[PDB]
């Protein structure tokens, strides 16, 4: 439910509010970062039609789209790596109702961005013989921006039961300042269900990269926002 955006340093970013109601009289905007407490960045007053900011932020940093009838948008300028985080809209109905929010990552250099490779590993026969349960492993490797979203689809349907995804990626080169990432996920089902050859399993990684607005000048492909995938079918042995 949370949108995601990756941007270069010094460029602008747009974030749309995901709230039950589109247009509220006062709409607040908060930032959350991993190490520190969330803080209110600003809020928008519809009556005065202006943003009320905090004393620690420049006035030429953020602004609003505020499309009528639609959810409001917040635009950020001259992005720096310390602007990476997650941004939540907020409103006062019962308590401070936070929106779904949007995750944002920004990079100084656009040269070191890569999309991930997705591989699917089939369950071991030993685990089927021992526990009567089958575990399928998805490995995604070689993505520098840790802004991926992994999911599993059986018979083309998103599954939330029996799925585990690692919460922190790991670096191939721990001694590198700018190192690439790898992530793993597991889906466990009854061995009878896996042994059915009709059942189709797919691991899908939504990778958040660049847009068509951005330009690319490399010999390589363009790491645009995309969906990488891998799949397998049941084996009855």
């Amino acid at each position: 439910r949370t949108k995601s955006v990756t941007r270069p340093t010094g460029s602008s970013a747009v974030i749309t509010c995901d709230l039950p109601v589109e247009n509220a009289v006062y709409t607040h905007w908060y930032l959350h970062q991993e190490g520190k407490a969330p803080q209110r960045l600003l809020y928008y007053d519809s009556y005065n039609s202006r943003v009320v900011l905090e004393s620690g932020i420049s006035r030429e940093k953020y602004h609003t789209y505020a499309s009528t009838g639609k959810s409001l948008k917040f635009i950020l300028e001259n992005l720096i790596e310390r602007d990476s985080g997650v941004y939540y809209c907020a409103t006062w109905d019962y308590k401070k109702l936070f929106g779904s929010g949007t995750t944002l990552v920004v990079t100084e250099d656009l040269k070191n961005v890569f999309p991930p490779e997705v591989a699917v590993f089939e369950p071991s026969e030993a685990e089927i013989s021992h526990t009567q349960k089958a575990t399928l492993v998805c490995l995604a490797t070689g993505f520098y921006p840790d802004h991926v979203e992994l999911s599993w689809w059986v018979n083309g349907k998103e599954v939330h039961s029996g799925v585990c995804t690692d919460p922190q990626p790991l670096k191939e080169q721990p001694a590198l300042n700018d190192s690439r990432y790898a992530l793993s996920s597991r889906l466990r089902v009854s061995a009878t269900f896996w042994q059915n050859p009709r059942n189709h399993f797919r691991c899908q990684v939504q990778f958040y990269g660049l847009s068509e607005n951005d330009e690319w000048t490399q010999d390589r492909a363009k790491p645009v926002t995309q969906i990488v995938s891998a799949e397998a079918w049941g084996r009855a042995d």
Binding site: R1, T2, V25, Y26, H28, H32, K36, A37, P38, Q39, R40, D45, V86, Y88, W92, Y94, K95, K96, L97, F98, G99, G101, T103, E117, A119, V120, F121, E122, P123, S124, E125, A126, E127, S129, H130, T131, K133, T135, V137, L139, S161, G162, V163, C164, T165, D166, P167, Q168, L170, E172, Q173, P174, A182, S184, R186, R188, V189, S190, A230, A232
Partner: protein
């Protein structure tokens, strides 16, 4: 006004009681205090609200959440008596600053206390299988699973092999949850038997033979 969460990050069991410590200093005589949480899916949800004289909780608490608000010590603690694995999250406490109009008010949060609810494996079956790779990739995958939460995963001995950490897999259909950890490498001398040699392994860990 300042809000501090002195409690460090804690790992509890699926049946313990969890206490989260939050202390506030404000000029207000009857401040509005709040407990919120951020889930791993980054969902920002309201848990509890407490003033000096009353409290109101979220619908999802179902009596499992309560608040210890003691005025003399200026303390606003959060207690989860039946703590489940579904509540593993980073919890924050906040206060409301009156700034003109009620809908213009700001919330000031604490740095955050993180709660990890490990599961209770009734019948541990620690096993290290070798999942055969799809011909799309050459890497070999070793899976360590069905171990108890007390066993702690240690990182790889060398950078040649990559080992993730503990993860919780819940089968809702069978109501059974297990623990899992993956380890992969492309080295020619890579074996699942020697994969987790850097971690404290249970003496009764299954080591299936490759010739199965």
């Amino acid at each position: 006004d300042k809000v501090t969460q002195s409690s460090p990050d804690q790992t509890v069991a699926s049946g313990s009681e969890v206490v989260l410590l939050c202390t506030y200093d404000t000029v207000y005589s009857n401040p509005d205090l709040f407990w919120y949480r951020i889930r791993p899916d980054y969902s920002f949800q309201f848990v509890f609200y407490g003033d000096n004289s009353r409290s109101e909780g979220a619908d999802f608490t179902q009596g499992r959440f309560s608040v210890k608000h003691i005025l003399t010590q200026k303390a606003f603690h959060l207690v989860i008596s039946p703590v489940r694995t579904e509540d593993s999250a980073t919890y924050y406490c906040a206060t409301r600053l009156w700034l003109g109009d009620p809908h213009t008010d700001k919330l000031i949060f604490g740095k955050g206390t993180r709660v990890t609810v490990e599961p209770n494996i009734q019948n541990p079956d620690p096993a290290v299988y070798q999942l055969r790779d799809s011909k799309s990739s050459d890497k070999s995958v070793c899976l360590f699973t069905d171990f108890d939460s007390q066993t702690n995963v240690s990182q790889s001995k060398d950078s040649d092999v990559y080992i993730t950490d503990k993860c919780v897999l819940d089968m809702r259909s069978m109501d059974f949850k297990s623990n899992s950890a993956v380890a992969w490498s492309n080295k020619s001398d890579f074996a699942c038997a020697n994969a987790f040699n850097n971690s404290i392994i249970p003496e009764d860990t299954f080591f299936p033979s490759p010739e199965s």
